[model samples]
Target: KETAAAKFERQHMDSSTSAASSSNYCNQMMKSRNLTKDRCKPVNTFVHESLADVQAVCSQKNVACKXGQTNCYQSYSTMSITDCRETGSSKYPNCAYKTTQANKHIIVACEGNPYVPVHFDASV
Candidate 1:
């Protein structure tokens, strides 16, 4: 069984990857990471930073979550990340996504036993 932390890492962390080469980066990752279950995840984020750094967001500056969650924090320094958005023309299993890589401050919603990230709120 996958823990929430493990699942979060599997879906959002991409510390091993550098710059994206093609628009298909998200298309491939979204599916490979198992987020294309019932349907594609409309929007997702992949952080290109280390696991420790990404986890430290929980202790960063307070920020309002896009979804109105209060337990969110924004990164102190801009970090590398890729935003994956499902293309409008995407069909069920086809699950297409647009890959956009950028260096930006990320806002994440977090919660857990020892305090960990549960969702990627946004990257700005």
Candidate 2:
């Protein structure tokens, strides 16, 4: 397994091209649906880095998950436990804050999970 920072880096780096692809996606979906520009949003992104780990997280959270649909994501090497079970990050602001690192290998925290871009190196 890669380091936590490594995971972040990899994800962010890949996200660049994703943005462009997403724009095209938005355009296509909008055209097909005849929806306004502001009404469209990215379809649910199902990213499964590891199936077993994702299942564990879902199980811990007591949330039902299905592969490739609502429950698909690899477990983090650091800590499999995450706040992802919550309905939305907006509901509990700062609930993920950790000063003593009590939660080892925490993935999603607070409003967002701080991850390094996949392309990150010694320099920005």
Candidate 3:
């Protein structure tokens, strides 16, 4: 079974490229990452940082998650990120996306023995 930490990584981590410079980034990534297989993911955010850096966020300042969970933490510094949103005409098997890049403090929920990000709550 896929762990929450692993799922978070698959959906949000992208350390190699900058969507800001690539207009077709979301369209390509969402498909390549298998997020468009069953249905459009609607919206997702990818962090342009190393896996180690993102995992370290579990040790950052504690904050409340969107659902009121207290296990969420906010990154201490701004990080580069790209938000992918499905277009109005998006359809299953062809999840078209619009990408928006920004630098913000990422908020994520962490758990387990190693204490890693289990959910990407938001970015501020």
lDDT of each: 0.86, 0.26, 0.89
Q: Output the better candidate (2/3) by lDDT.
A: 3
Q: Write down the TM-score of every candidate.
A: 0.91, 0.20, 0.92
lDDT tens readout by residue for model 2, 1-124: 7664454333322222312243234233223333223432222121223433322432232211232223222224443111111123312222211111112322221111432212111100
Full ranking by lDDT: 3, 1, 2
Task: Point to the candidate with the largest lDDT.
Answer: 3
Residue lDDT tens for model 1, 26-98 = 8888888999989878998899889888889999999888876689999999999998888889988889988
Candidate 1 regions with alpha-carbon error over 4 angstroms: none
Query: Which is superior by TM-score, 1 or 2?
Result: 1
What candidate 3 gets wrong by more than 4 Å, as runs, is 18-21
For candidate 1, the 10 contiguous residues with the lowest summed lDDT are: 15-24
